[PDB]
Write an enzyme that holds these catalytic residues in place. Structure first.
Site, short mmCIF file in Angstrom:
data_model
loop_
_atom_site.label_atom_id
_atom_site.label_comp_id
_atom_site.label_asym_id
_atom_site.label_seq_id
_atom_site.Cartn_x
_atom_site.Cartn_y
_atom_site.Cartn_z
N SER A 22 -0.16 -0.97 -6.58
CA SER A 22 0.11 -2.10 -7.45
C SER A 22 0.85 -1.65 -8.71
N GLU A 47 3.77 -34.47 -0.96
CA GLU A 47 2.61 -34.06 -1.72
C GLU A 47 3.06 -33.15 -2.87
N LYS A 96 -14.71 -7.58 -9.99
CA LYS A 96 -13.77 -8.42 -10.74
C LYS A 96 -13.21 -9.55 -9.87
N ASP A 97 -12.88 -9.23 -8.61
CA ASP A 97 -12.45 -10.29 -7.70
C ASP A 97 -13.60 -11.23 -7.38
N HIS A 106 0.80 -1.21 0.00
CA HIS A 106 0.00 0.00 0.00
C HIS A 106 0.84 1.26 0.00
C1 HEC Z 1 -6.41 -25.83 13.34
C2 HEC Z 1 -6.08 -24.93 12.41
C3 HEC Z 1 -5.48 -25.27 11.03
C4 HEC Z 1 -5.05 -24.31 10.25
C5 HEC Z 1 -5.11 -22.83 10.64
C6 HEC Z 1 -4.55 -24.90 9.03
N1 HEC Z 1 -4.70 -26.26 9.11
FE1 HEC Z 1 -3.88 -27.49 7.67
N2 HEC Z 1 -4.63 -29.01 8.94
C7 HEC Z 1 -5.25 -28.92 10.16
C8 HEC Z 1 -5.47 -30.24 10.71
C9 HEC Z 1 -6.13 -30.53 12.07
C10 HEC Z 1 -5.01 -31.10 9.83
C11 HEC Z 1 -5.00 -32.64 9.95
C12 HEC Z 1 -6.36 -33.24 9.64
C13 HEC Z 1 -6.49 -33.49 8.17
O1 HEC Z 1 -5.45 -33.63 7.48
O2 HEC Z 1 -7.64 -33.56 7.68
C14 HEC Z 1 -4.47 -30.35 8.71
C15 HEC Z 1 -3.90 -30.90 7.61
C16 HEC Z 1 -3.34 -30.21 6.58
C17 HEC Z 1 -2.81 -30.81 5.39
C18 HEC Z 1 -2.80 -32.31 5.07
C19 HEC Z 1 -4.19 -32.67 4.56
C20 HEC Z 1 -4.26 -34.15 4.31
O3 HEC Z 1 -5.25 -34.77 4.78
O4 HEC Z 1 -3.34 -34.69 3.66
C21 HEC Z 1 -2.34 -29.85 4.62
C22 HEC Z 1 -1.68 -30.06 3.25
C23 HEC Z 1 -2.55 -28.60 5.30
N3 HEC Z 1 -3.17 -28.85 6.50
C24 HEC Z 1 -2.20 -27.36 4.84
C25 HEC Z 1 -2.55 -26.19 5.45
C26 HEC Z 1 -2.26 -24.87 4.96
C27 HEC Z 1 -1.50 -24.66 3.63
C28 HEC Z 1 -2.78 -23.99 5.83
C29 HEC Z 1 -2.79 -22.45 5.89
C30 HEC Z 1 -1.92 -21.64 5.27
C31 HEC Z 1 -3.39 -24.75 6.89
N4 HEC Z 1 -3.24 -26.08 6.63
C32 HEC Z 1 -4.01 -24.20 7.98
C33 HEC Z 1 -5.59 -27.77 10.78
C34 HEC Z 1 -5.27 -26.52 10.34
C1 HEC Z 2 6.80 -14.56 -3.40
C2 HEC Z 2 5.96 -13.67 -3.92
C3 HEC Z 2 4.67 -13.42 -3.25
C4 HEC Z 2 3.96 -14.32 -2.48
C5 HEC Z 2 4.36 -15.75 -2.16
C6 HEC Z 2 2.80 -13.66 -2.03
N1 HEC Z 2 2.80 -12.39 -2.53
FE1 HEC Z 2 1.22 -11.03 -2.61
N2 HEC Z 2 2.12 -9.90 -3.79
C7 HEC Z 2 3.39 -10.05 -4.23
C8 HEC Z 2 3.74 -8.96 -5.14
C9 HEC Z 2 5.06 -8.77 -5.84
C10 HEC Z 2 2.66 -8.16 -5.23
C11 HEC Z 2 2.52 -6.91 -6.06
C12 HEC Z 2 2.80 -7.21 -7.53
C13 HEC Z 2 2.37 -6.08 -8.43
O1 HEC Z 2 1.42 -5.33 -8.08
O2 HEC Z 2 2.95 -5.88 -9.53
C14 HEC Z 2 1.64 -8.78 -4.37
C15 HEC Z 2 0.38 -8.22 -4.22
C16 HEC Z 2 -0.53 -8.75 -3.34
C17 HEC Z 2 -1.83 -8.25 -3.18
C18 HEC Z 2 -2.45 -7.09 -3.92
C19 HEC Z 2 -3.23 -7.54 -5.15
C20 HEC Z 2 -2.25 -8.04 -6.18
O3 HEC Z 2 -2.50 -9.10 -6.79
O4 HEC Z 2 -1.20 -7.41 -6.42
C21 HEC Z 2 -2.45 -9.01 -2.24
C22 HEC Z 2 -3.86 -8.84 -1.75
C23 HEC Z 2 -1.52 -9.98 -1.80
N3 HEC Z 2 -0.35 -9.82 -2.49
C24 HEC Z 2 -1.79 -10.94 -0.85
C25 HEC Z 2 -0.98 -12.07 -0.70
C26 HEC Z 2 -1.37 -13.16 0.12
C27 HEC Z 2 -2.64 -13.24 0.94
C28 HEC Z 2 -0.39 -14.09 0.03
C29 HEC Z 2 -0.34 -15.39 0.72
C30 HEC Z 2 -0.66 -15.46 2.01
C31 HEC Z 2 0.63 -13.53 -0.89
N4 HEC Z 2 0.20 -12.32 -1.29
C32 HEC Z 2 1.81 -14.21 -1.23
C33 HEC Z 2 4.30 -11.06 -3.93
C34 HEC Z 2 3.93 -12.20 -3.27
C1 LIG Z 3 -4.56 -4.60 -2.75
O1 LIG Z 3 -5.93 -4.36 -2.49
C2 LIG Z 3 -6.41 -5.34 -1.68
C3 LIG Z 3 -6.42 -5.15 -0.30
O2 LIG Z 3 -5.93 -3.99 0.22
C4 LIG Z 3 -6.92 -6.13 0.54
C5 LIG Z 3 -6.91 -5.90 2.02
C6 LIG Z 3 -7.41 -7.30 0.01
C7 LIG Z 3 -7.98 -8.41 0.85
C8 LIG Z 3 -6.97 -9.43 1.30
C9 LIG Z 3 -7.17 -10.10 2.41
C10 LIG Z 3 -8.41 -9.86 3.25
C11 LIG Z 3 -6.19 -11.13 2.89
C12 LIG Z 3 -5.95 -10.92 4.39
C13 LIG Z 3 -6.32 -12.16 5.17
C14 LIG Z 3 -6.36 -12.17 6.48
C15 LIG Z 3 -6.03 -10.94 7.29
C16 LIG Z 3 -6.74 -13.45 7.19
C17 LIG Z 3 -7.71 -13.15 8.33
C18 LIG Z 3 -8.35 -14.42 8.81
C19 LIG Z 3 -8.36 -14.77 10.07
C20 LIG Z 3 -7.73 -13.90 11.13
C21 LIG Z 3 -9.02 -16.06 10.48
C22 LIG Z 3 -10.54 -15.89 10.50
C23 LIG Z 3 -11.04 -16.07 11.91
C24 LIG Z 3 -12.31 -16.04 12.22
C25 LIG Z 3 -13.35 -15.80 11.15
C26 LIG Z 3 -12.73 -16.22 13.66
C27 LIG Z 3 -14.08 -16.93 13.78
C28 LIG Z 3 -13.86 -18.41 13.58
C29 LIG Z 3 -14.42 -19.33 14.32
C30 LIG Z 3 -14.09 -20.76 14.01
C31 LIG Z 3 -15.36 -19.01 15.46
C32 LIG Z 3 -16.49 -20.04 15.50
C33 LIG Z 3 -16.80 -20.46 16.91
C34 LIG Z 3 -18.04 -20.52 17.36
C35 LIG Z 3 -18.30 -20.95 18.78
C36 LIG Z 3 -19.21 -20.17 16.48
C37 LIG Z 3 -7.42 -7.48 -1.34
O3 LIG Z 3 -7.91 -8.65 -1.80
C38 LIG Z 3 -6.92 -6.51 -2.20
O4 LIG Z 3 -6.93 -6.74 -3.54
C39 LIG Z 3 -8.17 -6.26 -4.05
#
Ligand code: HEC
Ligand code: HEC
Ligand SMILES: COc1c(O)c(C)c(C/C=C(\C)CC/C=C(\C)CC/C=C(\C)CC/C=C(\C)CC/C=C(/C)CCC=C(C)C)c(O)c1OC
Ligand SMILES: CCCCCCCCCCC(=O)OC[C@H](COP(=O)(O)OC[C@H](O)COP(=O)(O)OC[C@@H](COC(=O)CC)OC(=O)CCC)OC(=O)CCCCCCCC
Ligand SMILES: CCCCCCCCCCCCCCCC(=O)OC[C@H](COP(=O)([O-])OCC[N+](C)(C)C)OC(=O)CCCCCCCCCCCCCCC
Ligand SMILES: CCCCCCCCCCCCCCCCCC(=O)OC[C@H](COP(=O)(O)OCCN)OC(=O)CCCCCCCCCCCCC
Ligand SMILES: CCCCCCCCCCCCCCC(=O)OCCCOP(=O)(O)OC[C@@H](O)COP(=O)(O)OCCCOC(C)=O
Ligand SMILES: CCCCCCCCCCCCCCC(=O)O[C@H](COC(=O)CCCCCCCCCCCC)COP(=O)(O)O
Ligand SMILES: CCCCCCCCCCCCCCCCCC(=O)O[C@H](COC(=O)CCCCCC)COP(=O)(O)OCCN
Lengths: 51, 385, 42, 126, 431, 54
Positions: free
Chosen positions: B206, B272, B228-229, B202
């Site tokens: 972009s 994987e 668009k998103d 920011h």
């Molecule tokens: C509790 C919070 C939780 C978060 C947050 C989470 N996972 Fe997982 N994930 C799990 C659990 C529990 C398992 C094992 C159960 C299963 O595999 O179904 C798992 C399993 C996995 C597996 C193996 C799945 C399979 O069955 O082979 C992968 C790959 C994975 N996670 C990737 C990710 C990635 C990538 C993210 C986020 C960036 C993420 N997980 C976030 C809970 C989480």
């Molecule tokens: C290794 C490279 C790379 C990774 C991995 C990456 N980003 Fe980016 N991201 C960028 C770059 C570079 C830009 C800006 C590129 C441009 O605008 O020309 C960007 C831009 C963005 C934007 C603005 C919209 C856009 O497409 O430019 C968002 C939202 C964003 N990233 C979120 C994420 C999130 C969420 C993840 C995963 C958690 C992620 N990024 C992982 C490099 C990365």
């Molecule tokens: C460049 O311009 C932008 C831009 O500025 C942004 C912000 C975004 C948006 C990007 C994002 C929002 C990515 C950021 C992602 C996060 C910050 C992840 C946040 C997620 C969490 C913190 C986890 C979510 C947690 C909950 C919802 C808590 C509730 C969950 C549970 C399980 C409670 C349930 C329990 C009971 C008892 C009901 C764009 O896409 C984008 O391009 C247009």
């Protein structure tokens, strides 16, 4: 009347380097603090009189 | 002023997703960021609602996963969304990083953004590996064993580091319990790094697919890039719904439904599908220590990228040879994945070594030489003397 | 009263400044706190 | 990060040699019209990235009318790339109009920054 | 050139410049502003302005004699300029002005009119001349409760209490024989001045000025004269410098010369060879600054004064200036030392060898009062050539690296932070 | 000035901090172990092992 530079000067590098050796020494003293209790380093770490 | 501008909380929502000035020429490749955000929310919500039924003991892990897939209402939806959504998370992240390499978004003034992106990539690989080991199948157990022995390659210290990681002497109950705790923990670090990523984005806005400035014709975020998103969100949910409901176990490996047996080694241990290029890079080096160093250098060589792109125009849009060698690189990365999926057999060793060399040569030799030649060719094409 | 007449600080000033003594005592105490903080962090 | 003095030195060494010019100037303008920045209605000096302070200086240096023309070419390029079309053949930038207009401003800013850095790191004639 | 000196209780020191067209002759006393208690403060300013009074200047101007005076911390002076054929007239006038009588200068009407005029001038200085009153408060808080803190100009609360008795008491205690040097600069010969003084008598007094009980001692402090109704933010900041008769005199001046002076509006001032300018010109942090190495009899000051309109980035100005000061201790280069040598030769030869004879008289009087004889400029250039980089690093480690500072400021100085961050910025933590 | 060059560089300052902290950890561990065993003489297990000689 030029100099060897890459935005950092060779004169500046030789000015800071007798301090950078002391920085390396103080970092090794820091590792010597934070790595005792680790029994792999204690083959070396107790020699003179900490035993 | 307006309430979305004067409120403290809604000013961030405003300045990020409502009135953010976006360049009006960006195509659908500038949508993978929003798509990764949606897929991260999917992963976290399914992870919570599936980790309410998961017991992380080594004698109760695989049985609890099958308890989720059998006894929990709609639990097959949760696990299949979770695993296949992790696969789509890495696929959209690979497409996002390819958008970064192609259009030159790594160049100045966006080096901080690129470095925080590489940090997010490393943390996501770590999260996927830990969660794949939490299943404790056959592939989970033996992959954890191979990766931690790779950490035992470190000289004079490594065996004690590995006994620290295992919490014992092999992959056992403390290993699976701490992998579940770390795997619950690291996605919130990924969310914090994503917020830092959005800040570093920011402060300069972009890029655009032309490589020129976009300060002249800006259009807001709201309704334009919101809808668009929304288009690509519905397409992503459509393809995810296909690979969840109609063919869920395609991307996974069938050995992962065998319970974890420390005595029986599998016929072919393979991670994987997306960690296979890195596994091929590591398997191509005939040394353990140099293999681990080369595997981490294959990600740090993305950090050395903005300092080698000597092209004076931003992005590969209007350049011929850089575009050609970019697609050489992309299909080389696919060939690394397919080499890694195979066995250690003639001639896959020699092809793995050549493919690793072309990977590092693209990041270190091909880009600066081709960019210099393209600069001089642009100059002498139009300047007459 | 002018702004050139500084008010009374004489009850709280050192009777001898000696700018290596005071800075050495201060850095000794700050170094002792850093010493024990390094031990505790380890 | 090419430092325009260097690319100008290499290009002038190619142009002043007859053999190298006769060899790789047809390759050069073949590369130019396969690049296709003309078809969006741009010039190559409109295409240099301008987010470093030396190029920002060379854009402050520029006269007014060429600055307004450059602004129009950028906005028509964004609009044409947005519609995913190309400009019609009458509106393409021709070969004679692709003039290196911003190159001398860039080169004098290059020489100024180079001279400032050299004089900032001089010895003394003892 | 040559400076001669002779004695009979008075000290006669000259500079025969035969190329000049005038000749300044005057007495330079060894008392100054640093020899007053804080209740008779400004009595030297009042002697300056009764010597420059209207009747006295009229009687001077009848013969073609222009008067001049100067009040410093260490030395007063009372210089009479004339044509080179009228040195006898100037000596006889100075005799009649001080020695032969003082009651006609100290009449009731002349004293009341002069006290009114100096009270007007001190008030006009206090509420309109901002960088100089910043420097005076910098002296008033660096050396506080100590006689070098007193301003030369005097204070409004003290100067309205002076009467003629205090003027005469200061005259009897400080306008003495051994306290004074009679100075002739310009187009006069030394032998002519000595023979003309011996032709008259010109005996000021018996002698022995009172000795100060307390010596000057630096004291790190600050004073903040915050006035939000001013357009700028004036701020001085200094450490304990080197006094005169110190071996680190020219080294302290060359350290001041390394960072020089600057004016942001002059084009040739923005192109100087200072590495501070690369940090200071980007966001336009200040309008001007100057680095000063002030040297008094007992102590000294080394620091910089500045003024700025960018009142929200004052801390960045202080920060980059003090990191540049820390570069003196660690990594000052050879080229900066050579540049400061050339510029200090230049400004020192402009100061000592300008064409104005009254400035030569003030400087020669101060120098032969303090150190008994004037160091000529060629030996000064040899002492400047003898300075190396190691001398500057040793001096900076002695005087600059992690030493107490004194700060004075007025105007919109809210952007100026606390004392402790400015104090802690004197050492880099990276060395 | 006798000790200030020992405090002037920050490198030798933090080197003194780490060397003294190393020595403090060793000496303080040994001293507190010795005092805690001396205060409870006759109750620790090596005392009962010495008494029960069978
Ligand atoms: C509790 C919070 C939780 C978060 C947050 C989470 N996972 Fe997982 N994930 C799990 C659990 C529990 C398992 C094992 C159960 C299963 O595999 O179904 C798992 C399993 C996995 C597996 C193996 C799945 C399979 O069955 O082979 C992968 C790959 C994975 N996670 C990737 C990710 C990635 C990538 C993210 C986020 C960036 C993420 N997980 C976030 C809970 C989480
Ligand atoms: C290794 C490279 C790379 C990774 C991995 C990456 N980003 Fe980016 N991201 C960028 C770059 C570079 C830009 C800006 C590129 C441009 O605008 O020309 C960007 C831009 C963005 C934007 C603005 C919209 C856009 O497409 O430019 C968002 C939202 C964003 N990233 C979120 C994420 C999130 C969420 C993840 C995963 C958690 C992620 N990024 C992982 C490099 C990365
Ligand atoms: C460049 O311009 C932008 C831009 O500025 C942004 C912000 C975004 C948006 C990007 C994002 C929002 C990515 C950021 C992602 C996060 C910050 C992840 C946040 C997620 C969490 C913190 C986890 C979510 C947690 C909950 C919802 C808590 C509730 C969950 C549970 C399980 C409670 C349930 C329990 C009971 C008892 C009901 C764009 O896409 C984008 O391009 C247009
Ligand atoms: C694999 C699992 C991934 C899961 C992620 C799900 C999302 C997939 C994203 C794929 C993608 O983003 O590619 C974008 C690519 C470039 O887009 P562009 O801006 O240059 O084209 C402008 C368009 O005409 C404007 O036209 P308009 O904007 O009006 O509609 C666009 C289109 C929407 O389709 C898509 O978003 C991609 C399929 O609407 C339709 O008419 C669809 C008709 C059925 O679209 C293309 O035009 C295709 C070019 C080749 C790309 C091949 C991809 C292979 C990897
Ligand atoms: C989290 C808790 C971790 C605790 C680890 C403590 C490690 C040692 C810290 C103490 C230390 O050595 O501090 C020294 C430096 C400087 O501390 P200082 O004395 O304020 O700086 C003055 C520098 N002189 C002028 C003396 C050269 O101070 C520093 O370099 C600052 C370090 C602060 C660490 C937090
Ligand atoms: C460790 C670091 C991670 C590295 C990741 C490695 C790559 C991961 C693979 C992800 C696939 C992403 C493909 C590349 C995405 C960027 C491509 C792109 O930018 O598309 C635009 C490109 C040219 O379009 P222009 O922008 O130049 O148009 C301007 C009009 N004058 O248009 C095109 O040229 C056509 C685009 C067609 C895409 C083909 C994708 C092939 C996917 C692999 C297939 C595997 C099966 C063989
Ligand atoms: C397209 C997707 C649609 C789906 C809808 C869901 C999407 C929701 C996305 C919300 C994004 C909000 C998170 C962004 C964020 O946390 O960044 C805050 C950084 C503020 O710092 P700045 O950008 O310099 O702003 C300017 C600030 O310097 C103003 O200073 P100050 O007022 O102190 O503010 C600092 C905030 C501190 O908080 C954080 C987290 O940094
Ligand atoms: C944190 C998770 C990030 C996920 C990325 C999602 C990016 C796209 C978000 C789309 C939000 C649409 C809001 C538009 C809007 O309110 O416009 C409002 C009204 O528009 C509408 O009513 C849109 C119809 C309802 C669409 C509902 C879509 C819900 C499905 C969302 C699936 C993803 C969560 C303002 O529209 P106007 O300014 O043109 O008048
Ligand atoms: C994952 C987030 C990480 C950190 C990023 C911070 C961004 C947070 C985005 C949150 C967007 C939604 C927040 C809407 C809240 C706006 C309501 C509001 O500001 O009204 C506020 C009052 O707010 C509240 O009382 C409750 C706020 C709790 C919010 C908990 C979600 C009105 O206060 P007002 O701004 O008018 O000030 C007048 C002073 N009397």
């Amino acid at each position: 009347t030029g100099l060897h530079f890459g935005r950092l000067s060779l004169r500046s590098l030789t000015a800071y380097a007798p301090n950078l050796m002391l920085w390396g020494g103080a970092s090794m003293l820091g590792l010597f603090v934070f790595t005792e209790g680790w029994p792999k380093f204690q083959d070396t770490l107790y020699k003179k009189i900490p035993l | 002023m307006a309430f979305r501008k004067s409120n403290v909380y809604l000013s961030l929502v405003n300045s990020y997703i409502i009135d953010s000035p976006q360049p009006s020429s960006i195509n659908y490749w500038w949508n993978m960021g929003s798509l990764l955000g949606l897929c991260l929310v999917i992963q976290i919500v399914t992870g919570i609602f599936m980790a309410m039924h998961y017991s992380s003991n080594i004698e109760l892990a695989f049985s609890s996963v099958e308890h989720i897939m059998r006894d929990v209402h709609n639990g097959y939806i949760l696990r299949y969304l979770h695993a296949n959504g992790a696969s789509f998370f890495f696929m959209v992240m690979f497409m996002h990083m390819a958008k970064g390499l192609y259009y030159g978004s790594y160049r100045s003034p966006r080096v901080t953004l690129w470095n925080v992106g590489v940090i997010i990539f490393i943390l996501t690989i770590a999260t996927a590996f830990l969660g794949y080991c939490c299943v404790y199948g056959q592939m989970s157990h033996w992959g954890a064993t191979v990766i931690t022995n790779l950490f035992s390659a470190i000289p004079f210290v490594g065996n004690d580091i590995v006994s620290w990681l295992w919490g014992g002497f092999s992959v056992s109950n403390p290993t699976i319990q701490r992998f579940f705790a770390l795997h619950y923990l690291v996605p919130f670090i990924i969310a914090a790094m994503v917020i830092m990523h959005l800040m570093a984005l920011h402060i300069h806005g972009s890029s655009n697919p032309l490589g020129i400035t976009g300060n002249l014709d800006r259009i807001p975020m709201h309704s334009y890039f919101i809808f668009k998103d929304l288009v690509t969100v519905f397409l992503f949910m459509l393809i995810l719904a296909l690979f969840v409901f109609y063919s869920p176990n395609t991307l996974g490996h069938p050995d992962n439904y065998i319970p974890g047996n420390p005595l029986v080694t599998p016929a072919s241990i393979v991670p994987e599908w997306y960690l296979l290029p890195f596994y091929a890079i590591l398997r191509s080096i005939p040394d353990k220590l140099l293999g681990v160093i080369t595997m981490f250098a294959a990600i740090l060589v993305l950090l050395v990228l903005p300092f080698t792109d000597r092209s004076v125009v931003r992005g590969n849009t209007f350049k011929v040879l850089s575009k050609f060698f970019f697609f050489i690189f992309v299909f080389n990365f696919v060939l690394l994945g397919q080499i890694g999926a195979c066995h250690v057999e003639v001639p896959y060793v020699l092809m793995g070594q050549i493919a690793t060399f072309i990977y590092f040569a693209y990041f270190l030799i091909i880009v600066p030489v081709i960019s210099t030649i393209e600069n001089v060719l642009f100059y002498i094409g139009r300047v007459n003397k | 009263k002018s702004t050139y007449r500084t008010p009374n600080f004489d009850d709280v000033l050192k009777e001898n400044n000696d700018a290596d003594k005071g800075r050495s005592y201060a850095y000794f105490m700050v170094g002792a706190m850093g010493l024990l903080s390094s031990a505790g962090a380890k | 990060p090419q430092s325009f003095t260097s690319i100008a030195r290499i290009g002038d060494y190619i142009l002043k040699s007859p053999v190298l010019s006769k060899l790789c100037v047809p390759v050069a303008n073949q590369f130019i019209n396969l690049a296709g920045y003309k078809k969006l209605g741009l010039k190559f000096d409109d295409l240099i990235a301008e987010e470093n302070p030396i190029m920002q200086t060379a854009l402050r240096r520029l006269p007014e009318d060429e600055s307004y023309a450059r602004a129009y070419r950028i906005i028509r390029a964004h609009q044409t790339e947005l519609t995913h079309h190309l400009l019609p053949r009458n509106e393409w930038i021709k070969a004679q109009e692709d003039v290196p207009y911003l190159l001398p401003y860039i080169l004098e800013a290059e020489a100024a920054a180079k001279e400032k850095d050299e004089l900032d790191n001089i010895e003394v004639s003892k | 050139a040559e400076v001669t000196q002779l004695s009979n209780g008075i000290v006669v020191a000259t500079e025969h410049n035969p190329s000049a067209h005038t000749a300044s002759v005057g007495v330079v006393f060894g008392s100054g502003a640093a020899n007053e208690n804080p209740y008779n403060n400004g009595v030297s300013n009042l002697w300056k302005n009764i010597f420059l009074s209207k009747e006295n200047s009229a009687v001077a101007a009848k013969e073609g004699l222009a008067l001049s005076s100067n009040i410093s911390r260490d030395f007063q002076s009372y210089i009479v300029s004339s044509l080179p054929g009228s040195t006898d007239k100037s000596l006889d006038f100075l005799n009649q002005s001080f020695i032969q009588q003082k009651a006609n200068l100290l009449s009731s009407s002349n004293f009341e009119a002069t006290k009114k005029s100096v009270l007007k001038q001190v008030q006009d200085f206090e509420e309109n001349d901002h960088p100089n009153r910043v420097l005076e408060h910098l002296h008033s808080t660096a050396f506080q409760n100590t006689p070098l803190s007193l301003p030369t100009r005097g204070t409004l609360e003290s100067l309205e209490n002076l009467v003629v008795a205090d003027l005469e008491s200061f005259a009897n205690n400080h306008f003495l024989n051994s306290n004074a040097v009679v100075v002739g600069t310009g187009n006069i010969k030394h032998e002519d001045l000595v023979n003309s003084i011996e032709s008259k008598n010109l005996s000021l007094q018996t002698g022995t000025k009172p000795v100060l009980k307390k010596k000057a001692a630096f004291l790190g402090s600050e004073v903040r004269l915050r006035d939000d109704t001013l357009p700028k933010a004036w701020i001085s900041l200094a450490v304990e410098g080197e006094p005169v008769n110190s071996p680190n005199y020219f080294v302290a001046k060359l350290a001041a010369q390394i960072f020089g002076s600057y004016n942001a509006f002059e084009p040739a001032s923005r192109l100087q060879g200072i590495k501070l300018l690369d940090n200071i010109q980007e966001y336009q942090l200040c309008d001007n600054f100057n680095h000063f190495s002030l040297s008094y009899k007992d102590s000294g000051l080394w620091g910089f004064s500045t003024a700025t309109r960018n009142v929200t980035m004052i801390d960045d100005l202080i920060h980059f200036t003090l990191k540049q000061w820390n570069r003196l201790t660690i990594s000052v280069t050879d080229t900066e030392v050579e540049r400061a040598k050339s510029l200090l030769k230049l400004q020192l030869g402009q100061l000592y060898e300008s064409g104005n004879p009254v400035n030569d008289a003030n400087l020669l009087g101060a120098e032969v009062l303090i150190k008994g004889s004037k160091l000529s400029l060629g030996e000064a250039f040899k002492k400047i050539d003898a300075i190396t980089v190691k001398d500057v690093k040793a001096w900076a480690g002695k005087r600059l690296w992690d030493q107490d500072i004194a700060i004075a400021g007025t105007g919109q100085i809210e952007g100026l932070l606390d004392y402790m961050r400015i104090r802690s910025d004197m050492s880099m933590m990276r060395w | 000035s006798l000790y200030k060059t020992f405090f002037k560089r920050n490198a030798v300052f933090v080197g003194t901090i780490f060397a003294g902290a190393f020595v403090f950890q060793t000496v303080f561990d040994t001293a507190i172990t010795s005092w805690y065993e001396n205060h409870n003489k006759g109750k620790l297990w090596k005392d009962v092992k010495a008494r029960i000689a069978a």
